[PDB]
Structure formats: C-alpha cells, structure tokens
Design a protein around this ligand. Structure first.
Ligand SMILES: O=[N+]([O-])c1ccc(O[C@@H]2O[C@@H](CO)[C@H](O)[C@H]2O)cc1
Ligand SMILES: O=[N+]([O-])c1ccc(O[C@@H]2O[C@@H](CO)[C@H](O)[C@H]2O)cc1
Lengths: 497, 497, 167
C-alpha cells in the first residue's frame, strides 16, 4: 500500500516542454537510413522517410539537439552546406566513419520543420573556436546583407533559421574526445565563443557543457570551473547519463533513477555555488541533453570495420525493464522541473533510439517509445510536489528505494491532472491511494498500463508484445483516487472534467 | 488578507534544538560583569550572577559557543586554567583589552552547567595549531592517565568535561583577524587539527569555519576551498550574519531575512558541490554560529581607550523593529531545519545581547529577548513546509517581499502546533487564514503578540514598554484558524489537541 | 630524556596507546650499543619542525658548551652519541599520518630542517621521506617534488613496501 497527496497549491514548477526533447547525431544510421533514405518507397520529395516523420510527430518532441555529440568536435559546418558536388568526404574520427556530408545543417532544418521540432544547434569547440562559432550563428540567424547571411540565402534558404538555443561544443572532458580541453581551457573558449555568438544575435541562449559522465575523475570540479569562466554569458549547464543492466539485477537497475536525482541535485548545487561566488541575480538551469539506457549493443559495435558509410552503430534493442527505467527517469526529470528546463533522449532514430528502421523496410517502436510518448503527450502543465508514503527496499547500491515512483502534473488550460507512476515491486501489486480533495469535480478518464511478464522481452519489426493497454482500474470516490499498480508496471492515470 | 496551509504531512525536518543556541566571548562585559561578578548581591558561591542564570534558563538555550570569536585566535588556553596566581595578564589584540584570565575554560564549564547548556568549544588556529588542539581535547575529554588529563584532575575537575562539538578556529578570512589565513592555509591546518582532535576522542564533531561575512571578496570561494580540504574530517560549516538599520528604512530592514534565506541556500549548495566532488555519502550541515542585529553601539565603542579590563563594548540597546527582524531570522532558521542544525545568537549577555546587566545592579531583558524565548520554548518539533499566499511589497534592495513571514512547527509528543508569524506591514493589519484540516480536534490555546507603536522604542533597566501580551484574536471555525496580525507585529499562535 | 619522574605520560595518536616514555632516546642508544648497531634517528616533522630538529642534533652530537649538549651530559651521557644518519620525519603523504603534509609542504620543511641539522653537525647524512606506499595516488609525483625541494641538502630518498598473501 502507498499513499500520495495531490495538492494543486503544493507545486514544483511549470514543466518546460523542452524536457521532452531528443537528439540526432551524425552517428551510424541516425541520419543515413534513419531520417533520410532517398531509395525508400516511403521517402518524400527531399528523401526523408515519411514513416519516421510520423513516428517522431506522435512523440511531440519539441526540440532536437544536432549534430553532436562527439561528431561535432571534429566537424566543419561549411562542409555540409551549398551544392552537393562541392561538399567534401571527410573522416569522422569520433565514430571512425566516412561522412559524405550529403546531409548538412540546412537539410536537417528542413527535416526538423517536418516533425515540428526546433533545433538545439551545437558548435565545434574541439578543432575550431570563436570565429567559426560567430560565423555559424550569422549564417543561420542574421537576415541578410552580410557575407554569411547572403550565403545562406544563395544556398536556397531565404529566411533565417532563427535558432534559439545553442550548445557550446560537446563534452570535452572526455579523453576520447576530439580536441579535449581541460575545464579551464574549455571554460575560456566557451566564454569567448558565447560572447561573439550573442553579439551576432542577442536573442539566443547558450548551453555550456558539463562532464561527459558523473564517473569522470573531474566530475563536479569541471562544472564549477566551467561556470566560473562562463556564468555571465550562458543560460544552462548540461548533464549526461546513460544506464545499463550489465549484471542482470532488475531491483538495483530500477533504483538507478535515485542516482539521477542526486546527480541533478549536485549540478544544481554547483550552479548555485557559482551564482553566489559571482553575486549574480541570474539563475542557471540544467539541460539534461543526453539521457537513455545504453548497453545492449556494446559487443556488436566492436566488430565494425572503420571507414564505412553509415555503419550500424549503437543499435540497442530495448526490453520491458528498460522501458520501466526510462519511465522512472522521466518522472525524475518532471520532479526537477524547477531547474531542468531542457532534456534530450539520446538518440531519436536507430542510435540508442525509441524508433528503429530497416533499409527499404519498416520503422517500428521500441519498448521505450511508450513511456516517452506518454510523458510528452500527457506531461504538459505544472509538476506538483509528491508527498508520498511508500514501502521501500534495499538493493546492492541503494537503500530505502521506494516501490512507488510517481508525480502528478496539472494542466489548468485542459483541466486535466495526470498521475505517472511506476511500481518497482517485482512480485506484488501496489495499492495506491491519492488524496485529490484539492481538485473539485474531477473524474478518471482512463488508466493506461505498460506491463509484461518477461522483463527481457523486446519489440521488433515483426511483432510488438510490449505495448500499452487501457484496462487499469483507477477509480475516483469521495475525493480519493484508488488504483492497483501491477507488479513491474508503468501507469498513466488521467483525470479530467 | 493572507492564507497559509498547515499540512501535517508536508514536512521540512525535525528541528535540532541547537538552532536555539548562543555564544559568549571574552569580549567587553560578557564574562566580567555579565555572567561573573564576585560580590554582586546575587552572586553565588563561584561568583556567578544568579539573576543572569535565571534569565538564560528561561531562554532554554541548549548550547553556547565559547570563548570566541576573534578573541580565540590569539588566546592560549593554558593561561586560563590552574591556580589564579600563575595565570598571566595578556593583551587581547582582538578587542584591545587586558585579559586577566580570572575566568578560563573550567570556570566557564561550571557556569554552563548552571544554565543547563553544553559548550561548543573553539580552538585557536590563529597563533596556534594542531598540537594545542589535540592537547586541549585531551585536557577536556580524556578521563585520566596522561599528562593533560591528570592536569585537569589536579586543577579540580575529576570527571572530564566531555565536550561534543568543537569549532576549528574562528573565521580568519578577515584581514582584521589575528593569524589570518587564506582558504588553502586554513583548510590545511583545520584538516590536520580535526584529525588529531578526533584521534584523541572519536566521539566529537567538528565545525569548520566559513567566511566572516557574506560580503567578503572571498565569499563562497572560501567555503568551497575549505570544504575541499576538510570534508572527510568535519561535520558542519559555519556561517555568520549581522544586520543593522543604518539608513532608517524599516520596510527594507525587515526584508533582510530574505537575504539570510538566500545566504543559507548558497552555503548548502557549496556543501553539496563538495560532497559530489568527493563522492562522499556524508552530508555536511550548517552551523549559523553568529547571528544578530549589531549596529547601535558602533560610534560609542570608538571612544573607548585601549588596554582596559572589561570595557563596555558592543552594548547595543535594541528597539522594537530589531525584535521583529530577529523574529524573521528565527523563522528563517526554522525554514532551513533540514540543513541548519546549530545556530548561535551572538551574544548572550551584555555584548550584542538579549540580556543586559548593571554593575551591582539589575539584569534586564532587551526587546529581542522575547521572540528568541518564544522560538526556543515553543519551536521544538517538526518544521512544516509553509504554503502561503501573501500580499507583497518592493523596497530599495528587495522585490516581492511578503508582508507575512511565517512557519508552523508541529510537536507530536506535546500534541501542539505553533504558528510563528510576523506582519511586516507598516500601516495595515493582516487577516491570516490557516487551513488546519490535517489537525483534527486541535483548538486555539493562545495568541501571543509583541507590538509597539514606536519601532524605535527600547527597553531599559528602569522600564520595559516593549513586552508581549496575550490579546491576540486567533480563533478556530470550520477547520480554519483566522487571526488578525496587527501592523508591525510578532505573533505566536499556539494550537493543541 | 632526563629523570623519569619528570617524563610525562602521552597519548600516542599513531597507535592509540599511552606512551609512558620510560624508554627514550638515551636508553635506546644504550641498547643499540649492546647489539653493536648504529642508530638511524628520525626527527618529528609532523607536529614539530626545524627548531626541534636542530636542537635534537645538538643534544645528541655536539660535544659540550651549549645548553642542549650540556643537558645530555647532565642526563648522564658525557660523550656525544655521534649519530651519522638521520631521517627527516616519517612518510606523511598518508592521510593517516599525524601532521600530514603535501609534497610541497614536506619538501619545504625537510629542506629547512636538513640545513639546520647539517649546520649543527656537517658530518651527518640525511634521508628524505618517500611515499608511504607505491599505491598512493601521489606516488612518484611525491618523490619528484620532494627531491626538487631538498636535493642539495640530502643524501638518500626512502621507499617502503609491505606484502601479504590475502587471497
Ligand atoms: O559513459 N560512456 O562510456 C560514455 C561514452 C561515450 C559518451 O559519448 C556521448 O554519447 C554519444 C552518443 O549519444 C555522444 O556522441 C557523446 O556525447 C558518453 C559516455
Ligand atoms: O561584518 N562585520 O563588520 C563584522 C565585524 C566583526 C565580525 O567579527 C565577529 O563578531 C564578533 C562578535 O560577535 C566575533 O568576535 C567575530 O567572530 C564579523 C563581521
């Protein structure tokens, strides 16, 4: 048995819809054979797969980070614009692939328009620096009357792209990165790039890069130093986290969102330290601009020979337990809506992705597609503070793990309240009771449930045994929602009227 | 009108009673003519003023920091123990006074026993270091069978003092401090002192010093560096704040607790940054070990000639608005009960103090005595998260200042809820409505009010025009407590059942 | 040193023991003479520093005619001990050590101690301390920094190793 109070007046914050963002890199088949496949029977006039477009639209992803990721740190943006005959073939050192540049930034912008997403554009601060950063902002955002703006027009794009949010490089702390920089070296170049970008277009916002991983030896130290160098000139700091179940311990695996919670709290603390050090009135928020499960494909990738075009890298096939953890991660983002304003599921198509494609063949929804879709579609509004009383368990790496992971979101315009809830219990149902006295005249619309008896079950092109159903038993009586949350389940309880 | 939800299940934390601590330094008349005055008519067998003892007991102060403060940084603890004829007269460079050492640590411990307080003992890390720190802990806490423990016994104190909580120096970031140290120098000596102290007695806990003032050029940087050097070896970081009304702006003055709130949040953030950097499982908490109003006596002190014994320094005479600000500071401490575990009103007797004495004469209660007493007496339990809707104003230095400053404290053992509330409005009463649905069968016990028509009115030995009354109108009807909070008032609304 | 009744009982924080000081350096020298060994004497560079280092070398090695040499004589040891080889502290890179010092802090105090010790008695030689363990995070870095600070003034660098068969 668990209880919850859902009080309209106990609020975290309005949820920024950009927490339901995603990310496409020039990596593997994310672009080539993912969003773009000129051969394909379902390709549009520009070569974009229409089936993939529909699948992304249904997720209602508001913002997509591009073009990297590790790729960007060795990339020259000019190589991907202008007539195709003049675009060079390059060695991408990030993913040991040949990049044809058949898709570059203007074609990506065309695709993003089709799916209804804005683009969070990254600049290269690995091999390049401040001059290229200002020039790219000018190219994309300045209307006309300068060399680079008139160049964009000549390339066929009269109106500026007007990109709002930009990433200052990719995480550079990683010794695997092209043009690795220490926190001081990065903080300095990011500061100077931020300035010139903002001078070209003061309407932009900037994301400064945090650590590649919470496990880096420089974790926390990095963020504090980088913010000390950049605070006045930037708007967000990023964080990145990938999880996996490499020891087949489901109870411990589902608890990993507790670590994510502490991780967010730690980076918020660093931002507020530096705010105080600077005596600034501006608050810096978080961009959780890579997050996902990533581990299934690690061994397969080791067999791929270098210098092919569009190798099948990072093609994790997700299972049901991966979906539960993704649900827990989503709820964790919502619970930090006050300070996490952007987040990006890494990545959107083929590469550690909720959408998978086959050459000349179908596109399909992985298990993780469903909780992401439900969060994005039903998770707009104000995140309410969870007062939860829940039974708890201990695992290898965590103590006092609540069986219930939940939050409610109130949308005043739609007059809806949605309760997202994971039951982590591997054996028993959890009887949830929610005090909803603060909302008058509400009823249960539906109770969606994602569950499967085998946590290792996957979806595929041919069959999808892991799919939601609408037979949850939530009922609302004398100002109390009572709902049975099945063992190992993701639940979306929708209230309205 | 203002509203407030008093929800039992929306909790901040259990209040550590040590947030109602105080502080006595060898400064002015705090010791000599304050707690200790041989031949005063109310002096006991050991020369301690009984009237002061009774006044301190009524405040229920659980812990008292001693002996400094700036004094400790030039003090040799051996100078204050053993037979009086062998105790040297010293020049105290902190307060430009001659210190006779007629009172030293063992006599202070005797006094502390009379008022029922434990002592938060500070070690000198200005002119002294790690050897003196281990020796003092041995002297105080080791039972017997070593030179320093047997020395304590020979000085007349068979049983060890068993001091739990120790300060590693006094703030020495300040260029006015004896033996100023940079953050690195201080962090290093504090680290090595902490270790040897703990090796003498592992039951102790340690407070590492924060900045002298939030306005120091090294604020925030200091705390981060000091914790980086000491984290594994210490338990708390300190913070210090004094306020004054030097431009006669009451509306701006009463808003200052908003700054105190930001200040605490900033130091918490620093502690959590360093925790993440170290990958520690230990949370460091805060000791707000100097706070008060301090400004009235600044000009008078400039006329005192150096090298007298017990000069009348820091003798602020508090007024009614000062008591309102102190009330707001107390509520702010309670609002941070989750992370502020020790706090010390600086100071307890004569020196910026709630209790004042006259030579061979009376002891009396300053205006600020009353809100401190009420907080300490009625503010034990769990601090509840305030959910308030209040009208607001702007002042010189602050925006959106709520007219209402309030919190509720729930004592389950006493079956009581106490609402502390200041109305900052200089013209209008505030009609407070409190939702108490979650406290069924609770009734109003009493409504205490501290108010005076003249914010500049003081108390004195001869008369106390500023004193609480019990004519508050709080009343319960239909699960709602409604109370009129007069303009410029401190209110204590006690509920029970 | 000196009469036993004036020797204090101390808390030894290293091994969490009470040290009575019933044996001190002069008695140890008497023992060493019986087994035919010279003594490699260590000075405290944890809680103490350069003054105590010069004074101890004077006490042990200076013949007579100064306070500390005449003190040794008064304690019953007319002839100086004439200790050749001295350790500048014990390894203090370790967070378990009393008065831990960074490599720079240690290098500096060891340098200044070495100088005054040698000025009391130029016949001595000095050992500067290496890491407590090869597995310390500061291994190798430590030795390089410490020698950079002390090279001209010292004769040896130390190293320490313990083994076990715990699997
Ligand atoms: O933890 N790791 O092993 C790890 C490895 C690679 C890594 O790179 C990030 O993930 C890649 C895929 O999204 C992006 O290009 C890059 O920014 C981030 C983390
Ligand atoms: O901001 N200031 O002006 C200021 C002035 C003095 C000051 O010292 C502190 O306040 C003294 C009195 O409680 C204690 O001895 C010392 O720790 C701390 C701050």
């Amino acid at each position: 048995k668990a209880t919850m109070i859902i009080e309209k007046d106990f609020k975290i914050a309005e949820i920024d819809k950009r927490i339901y963002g995603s990310f496409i890199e020039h990596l593997g088949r994310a672009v080539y054979g993912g969003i773009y496949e000129p051969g394909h029977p379902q390709a549009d006039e520009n070569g974009f797969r229409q089936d993939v477009i529909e699948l992304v639209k249904e997720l209602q992803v508001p913002i997509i980070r591009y073009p990297g990721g590790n790729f960007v740190s060795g990339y020259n943006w000019e190589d991907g614009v202008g007539p195709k005959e003049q675009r060079p073939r390059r060695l991408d050192l990030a993913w040991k692939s040949v990049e044809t540049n058949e898709i570059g930034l203007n074609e990506f912008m065309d695709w993003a328009k089709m799916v209804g997403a804005e683009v969070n554009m990254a600049v290269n601060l690995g091999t390049r620096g401040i001059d290229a950063a200002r020039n790219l902002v000018e190219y994309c955002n300045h209307p006309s009357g300068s060399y680079y703006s008139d160049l964009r027009i000549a390339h066929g794009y009269k109106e500026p792209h007007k990109i709002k949010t930009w990433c200052l490089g990719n995480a550079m702390d990683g010794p695997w990165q092209i043009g690795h920089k220490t926190a001081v070296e990065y903080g300095r170049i990011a500061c100077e790039a931020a300035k010139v970008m903002k001078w070209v277009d003061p309407t932009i916002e900037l994301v400064v890069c945090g650590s590649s991983n919470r496990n880096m030896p420089t974790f926390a130290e990095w963020e504090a130093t980088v913010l000390d160098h950049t605070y006045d000139h930037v708007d967000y700091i990023s964080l990145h986290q990938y999880y996996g179940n490499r020891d087949n311990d489901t109870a411990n695996y589902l608890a990993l969102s507790l670590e994510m919670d502490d991780f967010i709290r730690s980076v918020v603390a660093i931002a507020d330290y530096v705010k105080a050090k600077k005596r600034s009135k501006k608050t810096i928020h978080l961009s959780f601009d890579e997050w996902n499960v990533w581990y299934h494909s690690n061994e397969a990738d080791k067999l791929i020979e270098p210098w092919t075009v569009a190798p099948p890298l990072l093609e994790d096939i997700y299972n049901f337990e991966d979906a539960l953890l993704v649900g827990c991660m989503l709820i964790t983002l919502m619970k930090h809506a006050d300070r996490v304003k952007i987040a990006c599921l890494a990545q959107l198509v083929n590469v550690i992705a909720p959408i998978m494609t086959e050459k000349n063949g179908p596109a399909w929804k992985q298990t993780i597609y469903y909780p992401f879709m439900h969060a994005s579609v039903y998770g707009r509004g104000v995140a309410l503070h969870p007062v939860i009383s829940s039974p708890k368990y201990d695992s290898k790496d965590f103590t006092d793990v609540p069986y219930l992971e939940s939050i409610a979101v109130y949308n005043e315009e739609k007059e809806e309240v949605t309760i997202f809830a994971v039951n982590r219990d591997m054996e028993d149902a959890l009887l949830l009771e929610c005090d909803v006295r603060s909302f008058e005249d509400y009823r249960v619309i539906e109770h969606i449930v994602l569950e499967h008896d085998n946590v290792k079950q996957t979806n595929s092109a041919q069959s999808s045994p892991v799919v939601p159903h609408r037979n949850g038993d939530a009922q609302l009586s004398d100002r109390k929602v009572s709902a049975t949350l099945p063992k190992l389940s993701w639940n979306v309880i929708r209230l309205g009227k």
